[PDB]
Amino acid sequence: STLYEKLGGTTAVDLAVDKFYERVLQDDRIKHFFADVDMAKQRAHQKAFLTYAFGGTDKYDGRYMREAHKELVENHGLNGEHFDAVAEDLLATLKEMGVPEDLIAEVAAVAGAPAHKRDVLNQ
Ligand code: HEM
Numbered sequence: 001s002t003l004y005e006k007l008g009g010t011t012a013v014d015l016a017v018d019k020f021y022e023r024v025l026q027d028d029r030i031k032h033f034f035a036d037v038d039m040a041k042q043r044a045h046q047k048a049f050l051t052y053a054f055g056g057t058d059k060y061d062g063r064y065m066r067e068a069h070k071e072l073v074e075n076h077g078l079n080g081e082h083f084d085a086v087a088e089d090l091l092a093t094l095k096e097m098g099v100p101e102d103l104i105a106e107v108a109a110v111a112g113a114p115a116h117k118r119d120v121l122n123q
């Protein structure tokens with residue numbers, strides 16, 4: 001079974017993403033990164049992205065992480081602390097939803113992979 005399946009599939013990811021952005025927009029460390037972001041579009045992209053990242057689809061139909069975050073790194077000071085805030089907010093949301101610790105851990109390994117971090121932070 002994939003991580004996607006174990007978590008509860010579409011409706012679990014849909015709920016997690018919605019809740020995650022609720023948490024992010026209240027997080028003073030990072031909420032301002034989304035000041036000019038269309039959150040309907042962002043929600044749909046993240047649902048599609050995590051579906052892919054958790055093995056629910058072969059591919060992500062959307063931007064690469066490096067190009068996606070480039071303007072944030074170059075113009076708005078996006079750094080490792082913001083990255084860690086995002087990972088922490090995602091995992092907090094899953095804990096709150098009742099996702100078991102062993103699955104929360106598999107998600108942490110995805111969100112924290114160097115191939116993700118280096119591209120997002122354009123390092
Ligand atoms: C790290 C765990 C991480 C992921 C995964 C991620 C995903 C992601 C997607 C799928 C998009 C949309 C891309 C597309 O256009 O197809 C996107 C866009 C933005 N992100 Fe992100 N992102 C991750 C990490 C971070 C971090 C650490 C921040 C800032 C705190 C952040 C922020 C943003 C913002 C803002 C956007 C929209 C960019 C824009 O167009 O202005 N992401 N992310």
Ligand SMILES: [C-]#N
Binds near residue numbers: 046
């Ligand atoms: C990016 N969220």
